[PDB]
Amino acid sequence: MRVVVIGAGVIGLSTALCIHERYHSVLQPLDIKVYADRFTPLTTTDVAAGLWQPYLSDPNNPQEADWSQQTFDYLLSHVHSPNAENLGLFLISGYNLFHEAIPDPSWKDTVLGFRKLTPRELDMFPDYGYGWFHTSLILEGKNYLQWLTERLTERGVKFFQRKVESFEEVAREGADVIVNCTGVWAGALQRDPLLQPGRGQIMKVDAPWMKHFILTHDPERGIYNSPYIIPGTQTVTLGGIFQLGNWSELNNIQDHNTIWEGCCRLEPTLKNARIIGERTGFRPVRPQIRLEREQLRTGPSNTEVIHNYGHGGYGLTIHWGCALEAAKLFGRILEEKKLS
Amino acid sequence: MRVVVIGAGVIGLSTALCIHERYHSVLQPLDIKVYADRFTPLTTTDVAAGLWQPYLSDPNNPQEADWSQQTFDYLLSHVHSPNAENLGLFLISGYNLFHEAIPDPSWKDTVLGFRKLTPRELDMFPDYGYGWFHTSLILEGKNYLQWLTERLTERGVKFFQRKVESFEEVAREGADVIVNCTGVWAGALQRDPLLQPGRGQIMKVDAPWMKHFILTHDPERGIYNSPYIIPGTQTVTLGGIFQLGNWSELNNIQDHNTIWEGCCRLEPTLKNARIIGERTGFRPVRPQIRLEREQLRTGPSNTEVIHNYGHGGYGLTIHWGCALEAAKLFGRILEEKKLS
Ligand SMILES: Cc1cc2nc3c(=O)[nH]c(=O)nc-3n(C[C@H](O)[C@H](O)[C@H](O)COP(=O)(O)OP(=O)(O)OC[C@H]3O[C@@H](n4cnc5c(N)ncnc54)[C@H](O)[C@@H]3O)c2cc1C
Ligand SMILES: Cc1cc2nc3c(=O)[nH]c(=O)nc-3n(C[C@H](O)[C@H](O)[C@H](O)COP(=O)(O)OP(=O)(O)OC[C@H]3O[C@@H](n4cnc5c(N)ncnc54)[C@H](O)[C@@H]3O)c2cc1C
């Protein structure tokens, strides 16, 4: 069985790995190749701070709630493993700030020690009147991506750096299954009007005294669109930009001032952190994740395409669940081809 | 009036500050001076991780508990100040690990969001069956000591590097008040059998992914003597060593291993942290802080000695309370001399 994964973000690589470690002992020639226009440093996944946190309001598909849950329980089970540091995996507590009282998140019992802000804490943030506090996990995209490769490489998963033009192209050269993990750019290979870029821009700053994450929430601004501060391993992420439809992969000097002024108002100590660099990325926005099979009707017969894109602003949070699912689906294919 | 302060550690400097700001206006010639044998870079106060947290069991003088309280609200109130970083001040949440269930601390409501660890959290630390979790503060002793220094230097307080041989020596040469902040070395000036060196050794290590302090408790070894992990700004502090009576200011190879071994067990990810520094220190251990006046009867008249030492292993946690008290005690000295 020749298997071609398109894309090398958290999704492609996490799906690649899963499919391997779950089916390599069962399929005799399980040949898995990764095709991607961009690698390790130049993906959206690298632009992610990697804070685990699904939306506030429930998802359109309750499957997703489990997927995130699955992912959290996985990473948490490994927070102490001797490899945690290569993964870029660590614990982080922090604040979720709100203007008015809002219902508990469905994930409340997933994070460690969930609870509500005690007045003295809100005192630290004059402009916010209510909020949560809990312990969570960070999985730095860059590190994680780097770690996934090593696992993948020693597993014989070959990487090629190319821009796939069509699903047929990849089919024409032997692919029995095509795992489709092409992120926001998925549209180029098959129309999907429901997919939109959630353009983001961030600032990496040096402020090692910040030990907590601090996410603001504002209805006049909308999801991911108010100041947030996520302490990384080597550097603190200053962010708060989400613009639908914007394809401009370029740091914007107007957005810069937004990030800076917003985060500085939040935490004035950040008023003397040294700016280390700025980045722009595209959230794979979709009413829900396309995580399903499709019989792609090739030449004489047809070839199986598993879709795995549209994880919007919470890829790292959900990725592992999705991978395990993309693997189950893979396994179904194997059954139907009676090559199980 | 002529004030001499002996001690350039947290107590000396912080006391001098309180005295000055409270009494520069009311005294015609308020002339404060600091004599110290060691300064800002080479004090015990410089080995202190700086974690705010008093003992678990209530102290002697219940007035102490009030002092830690004053200190904690003072610091919390400046956590977002423009100069919080020069102070070396920041917020930090973390764990406290106990073997069996055990009654809550007296301070439970001074810290932020105090609560008990939920079973899952306790599953992170297999060796511990019960504990607390709260947000707290660090005042890195070094950064703080440097900040005070500038404050004092700005306020015209003069510094002299000298070994004071006796109270009288300093009285003979002109002092009207002698604020005694000689910490653990207080004995060499006035017999105090209760004062004792609580020797400790720390390990500064480079593990920026750690966002929480982890303190352990084990009665078989008592306070300060079980693995602890305190994330500073530049580096993580490893520790767990308390030795009463030991006056060796010298890093110990057996102590090292003990620290390193103890801490790697607590949190395995430390196993791959690079070791940056190693340092010994003496907690000024006493049944209780001595914070009181004393008329030292010299020649014609006598001079006034405010004693302020014996803060053991919680000097930073408590410094501001004590400092305010010594300034109050200094106040009366004033009224009685008809200088109010
Ligand atoms: C600023 C910002 C902050 C974020 N913070 C977080 C956070 O804290 N937590 C969190 O969970 N998520 C966060 N996210 C979002 C999350 O990181 C993404 O949803 C996640 O990375 C999704 O994985 P992916 O689908 O992006 O893989 P991608 O990064 O989209 O993978 C794309 C790869 O596939 C290749 N490709 C695409 N089309 C083709 C083609 N036709 N031929 C060949 N190759 C192709 C590309 O070249 C690229 O190499 C953040 C996002 C942004 C922008
Ligand atoms: C390893 C370790 C970790 C610690 N961690 C913490 C923590 O996390 N939180 C916390 O709150 N506390 C902690 N402590 C304790 C705390 O650091 C001390 O209790 C605190 O610094 C007390 O202030 P001080 O008396 O030490 O001032 P000192 O450090 O004692 O100042 C001494 C100065 O006085 C001078 N001096 C002394 N005698 C004379 C003399 N006769 N003539 C002239 N000069 C003299 C000395 O040369 C020196 O300059 C820790 C202690 C240790 C050892």
Side-chain angles (χ1 to χ4, degrees), chain B residues 6-12 35-39 42-53 162-165 181-186 188-189 198-202 228 230 241 279-284 308-318:
Chain B
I6 313 172
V10 65
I11 303 303
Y35 303 162
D37 168 61
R38 312 177 121 176
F39 273 97
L42 334 162
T43 61
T44 16
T45 308
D46 292 309
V47 182
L51 175 56
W52 193 103
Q53 183 168 305
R162 67 186 275 199
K163 206 182 148 197
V164 167
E165 226 63 32
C181 308
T182 50
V184 65
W185 298 278
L189 290 161
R199 179 175 173 283
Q201 197 169 123
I202 58 146
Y228 65 73
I230 308 154
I241 283 182
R279 278 299 288 289
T280 291
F282 303 114
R283 308 175 186 79
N308 189 14
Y309 66 77
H311 303 75
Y314 55 88
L316 283 304
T317 301
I318 208 158

Side-chain angles (χ1 to χ4, degrees), chain A residues 217-231:
Chain A
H217 289 282
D218 192 297
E220 309 285 35
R221 304 193 279 279
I223 193 61
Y224 311 116
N225 208 34
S226 74
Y228 69 82
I229 303 160
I230 298 163

Side-chain angles (χ1 to χ4, degrees), chain B residues 47-331:
Chain B
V47 182
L51 175 56
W52 193 103
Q53 183 168 305
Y55 298 140
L56 324 179
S57 63
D58 306 9
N60 274 287
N61 192 11
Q63 193 177 212
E64 272 189 27
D66 295 330
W67 294 333
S68 291
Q69 184 78 232
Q70 284 137 45
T71 295
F72 190 85
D73 321 334
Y74 171 66
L75 291 171
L76 183 55
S77 57
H78 288 68
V79 74
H80 276 31
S81 177
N83 39 84
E85 192 208 357
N86 300 323
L87 252 92
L89 210 206
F90 65 95
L91 277 195
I92 183 164
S93 301
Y95 309 77
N96 262 278
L97 315 174
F98 292 92
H99 287 289
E100 308 294 345
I102 230 64
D104 293 2
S106 77
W107 42 268
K108 71 182 278 200
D109 284 278
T110 318
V111 313
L112 279 21
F114 165 79
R115 48 169 256 264
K116 301 90 191 166
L117 300 182
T118 73
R120 294 162 87 213
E121 294 167 79
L122 294 150
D123 303 320
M124 303 199 282
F125 316 104
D127 288 355
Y128 295 79
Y130 173 71
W132 316 321
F133 187 102
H134 63 281
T135 312
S136 195
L137 293 171
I138 282 182
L139 194 57
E140 313 251 44
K142 204 151 91 194
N143 276 97
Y144 193 51
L145 233 34
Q146 182 55 85
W147 181 83
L148 285 157
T149 293
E150 284 170 57
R151 258 67 289 165
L152 270 343
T153 311
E154 264 157 292
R155 287 169 152 73
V157 183
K158 296 280 186 153
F159 294 61
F160 310 91
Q161 189 270 148
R162 67 186 275 199
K163 206 182 148 197
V164 167
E165 226 63 32
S166 73
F167 291 129
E168 20 288 307
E169 159 190 332
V170 174
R172 290 213 274 280
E173 54 170 80
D176 308 341
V177 175
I178 292 170
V179 191
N180 176 47
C181 308
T182 50
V184 65
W185 298 278
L189 290 161
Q190 179 192 125
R191 227 264 306 185
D192 185 342
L194 304 179
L195 178 58
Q196 259 177 328
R199 179 175 173 283
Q201 197 169 123
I202 58 146
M203 198 159 319
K204 296 183 166 294
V205 87
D206 180 9
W209 60 89
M210 312 225 52
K211 309 302 162 165
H212 304 108
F213 69 71
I214 313 177
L215 306 174
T216 56
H217 305 272
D218 180 314
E220 322 277 48
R221 297 186 296 286
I223 193 59
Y224 306 121
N225 216 337
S226 76
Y228 65 73
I229 303 167
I230 308 154
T233 161
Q234 305 297 39
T235 155
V236 175
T237 306
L238 274 31
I241 283 182
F242 180 116
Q243 297 161 197
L244 258 175
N246 192 347
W247 280 100
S248 185
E249 192 169 34
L250 168 65
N251 297 328
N252 190 69
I253 247 292
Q254 228 309 79
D255 280 350
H256 176 100
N257 305 329
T258 309
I259 308 283
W260 179 258
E261 235 75 78
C263 292
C264 287
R265 210 71 75 260
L266 227 189
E267 167 89 56
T269 64
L270 260 335
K271 216 96 71 157
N272 266 257
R274 217 47 279 143
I275 304 185
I276 268 72
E278 186 103 31
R279 278 299 288 289
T280 291
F282 303 114
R283 308 175 186 79
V285 183
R286 229 178 79 113
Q288 54 169 288
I289 296 163
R290 193 205 181 162
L291 181 44
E292 54 208 40
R293 293 170 46 175
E294 170 176 76
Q295 267 97 160
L296 187 95
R297 295 163 301 97
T298 171
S301 62
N302 57 37
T303 51
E304 302 277 336
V305 173
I306 310 182
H307 283 84
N308 189 14
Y309 66 77
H311 303 75
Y314 55 88
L316 283 304
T317 301
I318 208 158
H319 81 85
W320 198 244
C322 298
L324 286 171
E325 178 64 11
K328 206 171 289 172
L329 285 173
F330 176 80

Side-chain angles (χ1 to χ4, degrees), chain A residues 166-176 178 295-305:
Chain A
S166 87
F167 288 122
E168 351 296 301
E169 177 199 359
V170 171
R172 279 194 195 89
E173 60 187 62
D176 309 322
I178 299 167
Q295 313 264 32
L296 199 99
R297 303 190 284 99
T298 184
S301 65
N302 67 34
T303 54
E304 292 269 14
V305 175

